[PDB]
Amino acid sequence: GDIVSEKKPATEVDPTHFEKRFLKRIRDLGEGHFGKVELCRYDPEGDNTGEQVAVKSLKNHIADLKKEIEILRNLYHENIVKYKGICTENGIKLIMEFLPSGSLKEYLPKNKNKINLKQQLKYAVQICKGMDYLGSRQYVHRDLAARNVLVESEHQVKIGDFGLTKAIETDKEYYTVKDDRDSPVFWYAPECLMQSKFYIASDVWSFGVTLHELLTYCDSDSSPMALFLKMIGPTHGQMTVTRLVNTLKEGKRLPCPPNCPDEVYQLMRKCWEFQPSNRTSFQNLIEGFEALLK
Amino acid sequence: VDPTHFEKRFLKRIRDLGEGHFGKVELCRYDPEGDNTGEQVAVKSLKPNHIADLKKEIEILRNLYHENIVKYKGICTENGIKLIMEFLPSGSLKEYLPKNKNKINLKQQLKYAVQICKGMDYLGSRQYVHRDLAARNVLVESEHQVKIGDFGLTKAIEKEYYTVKDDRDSPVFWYAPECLMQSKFYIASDVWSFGVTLHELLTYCDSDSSPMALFLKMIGPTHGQMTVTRLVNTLKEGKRLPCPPNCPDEVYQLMRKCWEFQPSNRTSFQNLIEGFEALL
Ligand SMILES: CC(C)N1CCC[C@H]1C(=O)N1CCC(n2cnc3cnc4[nH]ccc4c32)CC1
Ligand SMILES: CC(C)N1CCC[C@H]1C(=O)N1CCC(n2cnc3cnc4[nH]ccc4c32)CC1
């Protein structure tokens, strides 16, 4: 008889599946731990009219990127960056919505005239809401910093990278850190630096530092790293972290940002109690800021 | 004629003997007759700022007189200065022990331990903290005699301790918890470093059993900037270097007395001398 062929079934289109051949690289948006994010135009018509997207690719760690994809795919919150889809090659890429204003680290220095204290406190509430949503799903972020917070508009921010995000086991209080060589130490709580234990309260400490960055408009000369290095000394090399732990044990903290009212600084100080159990919660911070806003 | 004054024009560089913190030591022949018959000497000069530190080390060594402390011979003045010491051809215990295992038994290792303790006790009695006691800094005078051979980090105690400022190149795996956590160096901190030096001696300075290799296996070797806090956490938990192979429990128990978490609970050098002498 004639040569046989397979009956072709109805070919359905998945809007979350992005073809590699149409993902056209524009520029880098940031280097993460296992991956890197690039601005791409997904252009299936090949005429430079396609939608712009943020694409996360591996820089070995495919299992970690797959885990980050599955976390983000299932988060639905207005202050959390939107998952758009994937690009499958065993390799995989994470496709997200692109926010042209970029991160608060890039946005704030260029927009000081436009952003007053009231707008800074609204961003602080939005970061707390996104973080509380994450905590309620039993996740620890581990990388909350202004460079990871994106600007949706002048009125809206979104948490924008989940490269270090880990699930806390049910009925347990923290995640035990193994990979720590590239830890953002100047945003880390003492229990993270001393025992490699990450709690939801550890994310609250990182929020306090993120709030300090927002209030200083992310100026590089007032950055948490620049300020802590001036306090402890910048020539300690491998001894930097123990000197940082010793300074924190002594009760020393980042100073009140210029023009920051004491009532805002007092909420910031509640994020920095030495013991995780004595720290404020994200829900208590939302109430505190809302009271200062109205 | 000053016999402690060495003319630069007569010092012939031969080879390097070791790199320190602010300086480096070189083997030289001091040859004023220009016929290669001159005496061989160890010369410490600054690494090409820190002249004040080298001058301080020279003045410390010049005034130490002990059979288990390397002999000061003199200086070479240019502001510049070089430290002249006697040369020990057998070099350090780090170089000597791996090549002489057959010749050095437990009894000889315990005699070296007594000698290191005596030299260290002499230093402590002059109110100095060494801060760099390790097998690589102990020289072999002969099969029967060792001498502490570098004083690059040696500081006078005013008070019970010296507060450390320059610490980026700290030999962390030889350091007591108070040094790692608070940058405070006591005489008891030198006792902790001696315990680690004793472990090196007992393992014949083999690189695969070195205090760094053993601690890195315990804590993990991929922690980068987090290594020291992971080391502090392991020490806080009560974890210590294991008993060297073939080391009797009675020797290991003396070693463990150097490693009490609190400096005040640690053995003294005088108590270690008595302990080893009893075993000998
Ligand atoms: C994770 C940390 C270690 N790195 C340090 C440099 C910025 C940060 C990063 O890699 N990102 C990913 C890209 C982000 N980004 C910047 N502009 C963006 C615009 N749109 C975006 N959509 C998803 C991410 C994203 C954007 C900033 C945070
Ligand atoms: C101080 C530490 C950080 N360094 C790491 C390498 C060895 C050590 C050193 O610089 N020295 C100085 C030279 C010493 N040395 C080696 N053979 C020697 C032979 N004779 C010597 N007389 C005085 C020192 C000396 C000798 C060993 C320790």
XYZ file of C-alpha atoms and ligand atoms in Angstrom:
630
model
C 0.000 0.000 0.000
C 0.808 3.727 0.085
C 3.220 5.128 2.716
C 1.345 5.915 5.930
C 1.273 9.186 7.856
C -0.093 10.219 11.268
C -3.547 11.950 11.402
C -2.769 15.588 12.319
C -4.787 16.672 15.422
C -6.217 20.238 15.854
C -3.148 22.456 16.557
C -4.125 24.739 19.473
C -2.252 27.991 20.219
C -0.915 28.536 23.775
C -0.599 32.332 24.448
C 1.974 31.585 27.242
C 4.360 29.798 24.808
C 6.966 32.147 23.240
C 9.059 30.928 20.247
C 12.834 31.530 20.583
C 13.122 32.533 16.890
C 10.839 35.601 17.518
C 12.401 36.772 20.845
C 14.619 39.649 19.713
C 17.155 40.971 22.237
C 17.273 44.746 22.859
C 19.249 45.352 26.099
C 20.061 43.936 29.552
C 17.745 44.767 32.506
C 19.776 43.146 35.296
C 21.998 40.218 36.306
C 20.576 37.917 38.988
C 22.025 34.978 40.918
C 21.486 32.059 38.478
C 19.980 34.119 35.659
C 19.931 37.415 33.758
C 17.007 39.498 32.520
C 16.907 41.084 29.070
C 14.471 43.408 27.373
C 13.224 41.682 24.167
C 10.624 42.448 21.506
C 8.646 39.320 20.751
C 8.171 39.950 17.059
C 6.429 37.029 15.214
C 5.557 39.348 12.267
C 9.250 40.361 11.868
C 8.462 44.074 11.341
C 9.478 45.607 14.719
C 5.751 45.961 15.846
C 5.737 43.165 18.467
C 5.165 43.506 22.221
C 8.163 44.272 24.511
C 8.805 41.647 27.248
C 11.340 40.963 30.067
C 13.125 37.625 29.489
C 14.993 35.743 32.256
C 17.555 33.160 31.015
C 20.254 31.103 32.803
C 23.740 32.716 32.931
C 23.456 23.487 35.812
C 20.803 25.672 37.557
C 17.793 24.820 35.319
C 16.004 23.258 38.333
C 16.281 26.602 40.239
C 14.974 28.660 37.253
C 12.103 26.144 36.760
C 11.211 26.565 40.492
C 11.228 30.400 40.165
C 8.968 30.104 37.058
C 6.452 27.919 38.967
C 6.458 30.329 41.984
C 5.855 33.431 39.777
C 3.256 31.699 37.545
C 1.072 31.188 40.680
C 1.458 34.663 42.296
C -1.432 37.047 41.473
C -1.058 40.462 43.138
C -1.044 44.011 41.834
C 2.350 44.677 43.531
C 4.003 41.532 42.042
C 5.419 41.518 38.468
C 3.234 39.557 36.028
C 4.278 36.208 34.601
C 3.592 36.116 30.802
C 4.910 32.717 29.766
C 7.912 30.584 28.855
C 10.271 29.851 25.981
C 11.272 26.150 25.815
C 14.392 25.350 23.704
C 15.833 20.952 28.157
C 16.510 24.747 28.402
C 13.830 27.273 29.467
C 13.365 31.085 29.661
C 10.951 33.008 31.922
C 8.793 35.620 30.118
C 7.452 38.537 32.176
C 5.756 41.885 31.484
C 8.209 44.746 30.846
C 8.034 47.882 33.023
C 9.673 50.757 31.058
C 10.335 52.908 34.154
C 12.588 50.106 35.468
C 13.592 49.712 39.116
C 13.304 52.231 41.987
C 17.152 52.279 41.985
C 17.048 53.746 38.426
C 13.755 55.689 38.757
C 14.124 57.587 42.071
C 17.400 59.539 41.310
C 15.833 60.817 38.032
C 12.410 61.702 39.556
C 13.086 63.368 42.989
C 11.109 66.489 41.916
C 8.022 64.330 41.089
C 8.114 62.014 44.183
C 7.380 63.519 47.626
C 7.195 61.849 51.105
C 3.488 60.982 50.642
C 4.279 59.126 47.347
C 7.296 57.370 49.034
C 5.000 56.124 51.862
C 2.477 54.826 49.262
C 5.310 52.851 47.578
C 6.249 51.540 51.078
C 2.609 50.307 51.612
C 2.620 48.624 48.157
C 5.951 46.856 48.832
C 4.537 45.669 52.227
C 1.320 44.346 50.552
C 3.259 42.414 47.883
C 5.582 41.020 50.601
C 2.674 40.073 52.875
C 1.025 38.224 49.927
C 4.330 36.334 49.454
C 4.606 35.510 53.198
C 0.990 34.253 53.293
C 1.955 31.723 50.517
C 4.805 30.550 52.873
C 7.650 32.057 50.830
C 10.744 33.989 51.954
C 12.049 36.480 49.338
C 15.704 36.801 50.535
C 16.539 39.668 48.102
C 14.227 42.569 48.962
C 16.070 45.750 47.859
C 15.136 48.865 45.832
C 17.007 47.409 42.801
C 14.421 44.530 42.774
C 11.331 46.807 43.005
C 9.926 47.979 39.666
C 7.989 51.143 38.844
C 4.684 50.366 37.075
C 3.735 54.102 37.044
C 4.321 57.179 39.229
C 1.562 55.704 41.511
C 2.436 51.968 41.479
C 5.411 49.671 42.285
C 5.813 45.865 41.842
C 8.293 43.329 43.335
C 10.263 42.403 40.296
C 12.655 39.482 40.821
C 12.216 36.148 42.628
C 15.650 34.554 41.951
C 16.299 33.730 45.646
C 12.647 33.066 46.662
C 12.258 29.869 48.758
C 9.308 28.016 50.258
C 9.232 27.645 54.064
C 8.178 24.069 54.959
C 4.671 23.856 56.590
C 4.774 24.084 60.467
C 8.444 25.386 60.224
C 9.593 29.040 60.682
C 12.642 29.476 58.436
C 14.622 28.243 55.434
C 18.248 27.098 55.983
C 20.610 28.865 53.494
C 23.356 26.774 51.780
C 24.358 28.921 48.747
C 25.404 32.267 50.332
C 28.639 33.539 48.712
C 26.768 36.333 46.789
C 24.439 37.246 49.708
C 23.307 40.957 49.774
C 24.837 41.208 53.283
C 24.026 44.907 53.864
C 20.264 44.116 53.553
C 20.476 41.009 55.808
C 19.225 40.420 59.340
C 21.691 39.086 62.010
C 20.185 35.539 62.017
C 20.879 35.347 58.205
C 24.492 36.513 58.652
C 25.244 34.399 61.789
C 23.229 31.151 61.395
C 22.204 31.168 57.659
C 18.518 31.003 58.754
C 15.931 32.985 56.771
C 12.531 33.833 58.380
C 9.603 36.010 57.204
C 10.914 38.432 59.916
C 14.240 38.455 57.971
C 12.329 39.850 54.936
C 10.910 42.561 57.315
C 14.530 43.580 58.193
C 15.345 43.786 54.434
C 12.192 45.913 53.961
C 13.500 48.381 56.599
C 16.694 48.754 54.552
C 14.613 49.048 51.283
C 12.543 51.828 53.009
C 15.820 53.662 53.903
C 16.829 53.443 50.170
C 13.413 54.838 49.038
C 13.726 57.763 51.507
C 17.284 58.594 50.292
C 15.985 58.374 46.662
C 18.448 55.463 46.048
C 21.420 57.831 45.942
C 24.602 55.706 45.621
C 26.489 57.828 48.254
C 23.767 57.123 50.870
C 23.291 53.441 49.894
C 23.089 50.867 52.759
C 26.461 49.400 51.598
C 28.226 52.857 51.488
C 26.825 53.786 54.947
C 27.665 50.456 56.623
C 31.184 50.442 55.054
C 31.773 53.952 56.507
C 30.610 52.646 59.960
C 32.649 49.378 59.978
C 35.536 50.271 57.629
C 35.951 49.406 53.910
C 39.326 47.573 54.122
C 38.326 44.410 56.053
C 37.975 41.958 53.114
C 36.918 38.476 54.393
C 36.359 40.025 57.896
C 33.631 42.475 56.666
C 30.613 40.252 57.575
C 31.795 39.461 61.154
C 32.508 43.220 61.664
C 28.953 43.911 60.354
C 27.491 41.266 62.778
C 29.506 42.840 65.683
C 28.238 46.387 64.882
C 24.600 45.073 64.691
C 25.056 43.152 68.024
C 26.196 46.484 69.622
C 22.838 48.041 68.582
C 24.201 50.230 65.764
C 21.826 50.822 62.796
C 21.502 52.916 59.591
C 20.839 56.603 60.558
C 17.573 58.545 60.006
C 17.545 59.587 56.304
C 17.711 63.400 55.788
C 14.219 65.014 55.868
C 12.683 61.784 57.212
C 10.263 62.489 60.110
C 10.891 60.631 63.399
C 7.490 58.843 63.079
C 8.634 57.272 59.746
C 12.106 56.406 61.215
C 10.477 54.741 64.262
C 8.576 52.331 61.938
C 11.890 51.657 60.126
C 13.594 50.893 63.519
C 10.841 48.305 64.335
C 12.086 46.302 61.252
C 15.545 46.182 62.882
C 15.000 44.555 66.283
C 17.926 42.125 66.805
C 15.623 39.161 67.522
C 13.247 38.160 64.653
C 10.320 37.636 67.117
C 10.545 41.315 68.327
C 10.273 42.774 64.805
C 7.132 44.402 63.382
C 5.048 42.411 60.856
C 4.184 43.605 57.292
C 0.526 44.033 58.417
C 1.600 46.315 61.308
C 3.795 48.385 58.900
C 0.798 48.832 56.484
C -1.338 50.129 59.408
C 1.490 52.445 60.534
C 2.042 54.003 57.080
C -1.747 54.281 56.400
C -2.049 56.233 59.728
C 0.720 58.636 58.584
C -0.957 58.989 55.148
C -4.451 59.917 56.545
C 82.868 49.249 63.822
C 79.308 48.177 64.780
C 78.922 44.365 64.277
C 75.090 44.807 64.039
C 75.390 47.229 61.078
C 75.188 45.471 57.692
C 76.167 47.440 54.560
C 73.669 47.143 51.667
C 76.531 46.936 49.091
C 77.706 43.606 50.658
C 74.270 41.855 50.847
C 73.881 39.384 47.919
C 70.253 38.153 47.418
C 70.050 34.360 46.906
C 66.387 33.290 47.220
C 63.072 34.024 48.960
C 62.306 32.413 52.361
C 58.731 33.653 52.791
C 56.276 36.518 52.316
C 54.884 38.177 55.434
C 52.230 40.852 55.979
C 54.233 44.098 55.467
C 57.526 42.446 54.557
C 59.311 39.552 52.854
C 62.280 37.485 53.999
C 65.170 36.600 51.669
C 68.227 34.433 52.063
C 71.359 36.623 51.437
C 75.142 36.143 51.733
C 76.749 39.105 53.545
C 80.034 39.157 51.622
C 82.304 42.167 52.550
C 85.387 40.349 51.122
C 83.615 39.806 47.746
C 84.835 36.187 47.383
C 81.608 34.211 48.312
C 82.992 33.243 51.738
C 80.629 35.483 53.698
C 78.023 34.351 56.208
C 74.466 33.499 55.024
C 71.718 35.592 56.714
C 67.890 35.967 56.579
C 66.919 39.517 55.517
C 63.458 41.040 56.056
C 62.609 44.094 53.913
C 59.328 45.941 53.169
C 57.158 44.684 50.266
C 57.332 47.377 47.490
C 54.244 53.137 53.802
C 54.826 50.463 56.529
C 58.366 51.425 57.675
C 57.014 52.261 61.165
C 55.658 48.666 61.490
C 58.977 47.072 60.333
C 60.925 49.380 62.724
C 58.616 48.200 65.584
C 59.217 44.517 64.683
C 63.011 45.163 64.600
C 62.923 46.753 68.100
C 60.805 43.845 69.486
C 63.145 41.138 68.051
C 66.336 43.018 69.042
C 65.279 42.759 72.709
C 64.123 39.092 72.733
C 66.814 36.647 73.938
C 65.578 33.044 74.125
C 66.861 29.771 72.683
C 63.453 29.131 71.009
C 63.277 32.608 69.383
C 65.143 33.349 66.094
C 68.239 35.502 66.697
C 68.393 39.141 65.688
C 71.751 39.841 63.967
C 71.424 43.506 62.983
C 70.081 46.060 60.517
C 70.800 47.533 57.121
C 70.005 51.294 56.954
C 69.654 53.102 53.582
C 64.580 56.313 55.888
C 64.701 52.693 54.594
C 65.673 49.755 56.853
C 66.132 45.937 56.627
C 66.022 43.398 59.495
C 69.007 40.973 59.614
C 68.486 37.594 61.317
C 70.379 34.279 61.567
C 69.565 31.819 58.744
C 68.199 28.352 59.583
C 68.892 26.070 56.567
C 66.275 23.442 57.612
C 63.611 26.150 57.199
C 60.141 25.952 58.757
C 58.325 22.955 60.313
C 55.881 23.238 57.340
C 58.792 22.402 54.972
C 60.781 20.156 57.371
C 58.147 17.758 58.809
C 56.810 16.250 55.484
C 60.426 15.410 54.449
C 61.496 13.997 57.867
C 58.548 11.844 59.174
C 60.840 8.785 59.527
C 63.280 10.785 61.742
C 60.652 12.562 63.969
C 58.600 10.413 66.391
C 55.897 11.441 68.968
C 58.520 12.055 71.677
C 60.414 14.514 69.366
C 57.074 16.215 68.368
C 56.248 16.746 72.105
C 59.747 18.256 72.659
C 59.099 20.722 69.800
C 55.696 21.501 71.458
C 57.510 22.305 74.797
C 60.024 24.534 72.939
C 57.264 26.451 71.108
C 55.451 26.920 74.500
C 58.681 28.217 76.178
C 59.357 30.729 73.388
C 55.688 31.846 73.506
C 55.697 32.144 77.303
C 58.858 34.312 77.102
C 56.975 36.538 74.585
C 53.841 36.715 76.794
C 55.940 37.643 79.870
C 57.232 40.694 77.865
C 53.487 41.651 77.296
C 53.401 40.774 73.599
C 50.731 38.951 71.554
C 52.138 37.055 68.518
C 48.929 36.835 66.376
C 50.509 34.482 63.766
C 51.557 31.309 65.573
C 51.514 28.531 62.935
C 53.927 25.750 61.854
C 54.949 27.857 58.810
C 56.378 30.470 61.271
C 58.346 27.935 63.398
C 61.905 27.230 62.218
C 64.024 24.116 62.625
C 67.408 24.859 64.227
C 68.315 21.116 64.273
C 66.493 17.787 64.662
C 66.380 18.612 68.444
C 65.544 22.351 68.376
C 62.869 24.728 66.992
C 62.645 28.560 67.098
C 59.705 30.972 66.506
C 60.791 32.635 63.298
C 58.583 35.596 62.342
C 57.183 38.522 64.366
C 55.412 40.487 61.575
C 52.084 40.736 63.453
C 53.540 40.903 67.017
C 51.908 43.669 69.137
C 52.470 44.985 72.656
C 49.541 44.705 75.091
C 49.141 48.140 76.837
C 44.900 45.944 79.670
C 44.332 42.274 78.604
C 44.159 42.440 74.806
C 45.122 44.309 71.654
C 42.313 45.639 69.399
C 42.883 44.523 65.755
C 42.318 47.109 62.951
C 44.201 45.596 59.964
C 42.596 42.130 59.578
C 41.908 41.431 55.868
C 44.792 38.865 55.648
C 44.051 37.252 59.067
C 45.040 33.507 59.343
C 41.386 32.776 60.305
C 41.761 28.979 60.650
C 44.315 29.506 63.493
C 42.185 32.183 65.239
C 40.207 32.055 68.488
C 36.472 33.098 68.454
C 37.126 36.469 70.204
C 39.603 37.364 67.360
C 37.077 36.425 64.656
C 34.013 38.033 66.347
C 35.324 41.128 68.205
C 38.850 41.672 66.683
C 40.324 41.362 70.222
C 43.648 39.539 70.663
C 44.646 38.162 74.132
C 47.606 36.000 75.290
C 44.901 33.266 75.568
C 44.266 33.831 71.803
C 47.938 32.815 71.163
C 47.246 29.648 73.275
C 44.341 28.781 70.867
C 46.729 29.286 67.880
C 49.273 27.024 69.650
C 46.625 24.260 69.847
C 46.196 24.501 66.057
C 50.061 24.606 65.600
C 50.273 21.419 67.771
C 47.665 19.733 65.487
C 49.887 20.673 62.453
C 52.973 19.194 64.098
C 51.163 15.946 64.910
C 49.888 15.641 61.281
C 53.490 16.359 60.068
C 52.182 19.534 58.307
C 50.561 17.470 55.553
C 48.616 19.858 53.268
C 45.573 17.492 53.075
C 45.213 17.497 56.901
C 45.981 21.237 57.306
C 43.703 23.255 59.671
C 42.316 25.160 56.619
C 41.559 21.920 54.614
C 39.888 20.305 57.687
C 37.788 23.348 58.631
C 36.741 23.893 54.966
C 35.548 20.238 54.832
C 33.543 20.853 58.087
C 31.942 24.203 57.060
C 31.979 23.942 53.245
C 34.503 25.458 50.771
C 32.055 27.493 48.613
C 30.964 30.198 51.108
C 33.237 33.078 49.966
C 32.630 36.206 52.136
C 30.439 34.048 54.490
C 33.304 31.623 55.405
C 34.346 33.401 58.659
C 30.766 33.676 60.078
C 30.244 29.953 59.219
C 33.559 29.214 61.035
C 32.407 31.294 64.098
C 29.033 29.407 64.078
C 30.777 25.969 63.981
C 33.093 27.021 66.887
C 30.076 28.369 68.902
C 28.405 24.912 68.446
C 31.472 23.312 70.141
C 32.959 21.734 67.007
C 36.795 21.489 66.884
C 39.626 19.950 64.789
C 39.613 16.118 65.236
C 42.263 14.054 67.087
C 45.213 13.650 64.652
C 45.866 10.017 63.529
C 48.084 8.112 66.028
C 47.759 10.933 68.581
C 47.104 9.550 72.113
C 44.036 10.879 73.979
C 46.313 12.413 76.698
C 48.019 14.607 74.025
C 44.621 15.494 72.410
C 43.188 16.487 75.829
C 45.991 19.081 76.267
C 45.232 20.322 72.715
C 41.480 20.639 73.642
C 42.403 22.826 76.697
C 43.806 25.404 74.177
C 40.333 25.505 72.552
C 37.944 26.488 75.364
C 35.466 29.010 73.852
C 36.149 31.602 76.577
C 39.768 32.910 76.752
C 39.732 32.787 80.622
C 38.981 28.981 80.596
C 41.961 28.133 78.362
C 45.179 26.550 79.626
C 48.288 28.753 80.044
C 51.638 28.079 78.264
C 53.184 27.241 81.693
C 50.450 24.547 82.288
C 51.033 23.086 78.759
C 54.826 22.801 79.478
C 54.070 20.866 82.713
C 51.571 18.626 80.855
C 53.986 17.729 78.014
C 56.945 17.262 80.452
C 54.741 14.758 82.407
C 54.051 12.807 79.175
C 57.774 12.907 78.264
C 18.520 40.086 41.319
C 19.569 41.181 41.562
C 20.818 40.445 42.076
N 19.859 41.986 40.336
C 20.915 43.025 40.569
C 20.785 43.964 39.358
C 19.257 44.138 39.291
C 18.688 42.786 39.824
C 17.970 42.069 38.692
O 18.593 41.185 38.104
N 16.697 42.396 38.305
C 16.045 41.702 37.170
C 15.598 42.731 36.097
C 14.757 43.844 36.752
N 14.188 44.830 35.816
C 14.651 46.106 35.580
N 13.845 46.737 34.776
C 12.801 45.932 34.452
C 11.646 46.106 33.668
N 10.754 45.132 33.555
C 10.903 43.944 34.171
N 10.130 42.810 34.228
C 10.734 41.855 35.004
C 11.894 42.322 35.495
C 12.038 43.689 34.977
C 13.008 44.699 35.117
C 15.469 44.522 37.950
C 15.868 43.438 38.976
C 54.503 35.340 57.959
C 53.786 34.294 57.090
C 52.503 34.978 56.603
N 54.643 33.809 55.967
C 53.940 32.888 55.018
C 55.052 32.092 54.320
C 55.981 31.803 55.509
C 55.842 33.034 56.442
C 57.101 33.894 56.444
O 57.097 34.932 55.782
N 58.221 33.532 57.139
C 59.447 34.370 57.107
C 60.619 33.519 56.579
C 60.773 32.276 57.466
N 61.922 31.437 57.110
C 61.886 30.302 56.342
N 63.059 29.746 56.323
C 63.913 30.455 57.106
C 65.257 30.296 57.457
N 65.826 31.118 58.323
C 65.190 32.184 58.831
N 65.580 33.177 59.689
C 64.548 34.055 59.912
C 63.462 33.658 59.224
C 63.843 32.445 58.497
C 63.188 31.554 57.626
C 59.484 31.425 57.547
C 58.299 32.313 57.971
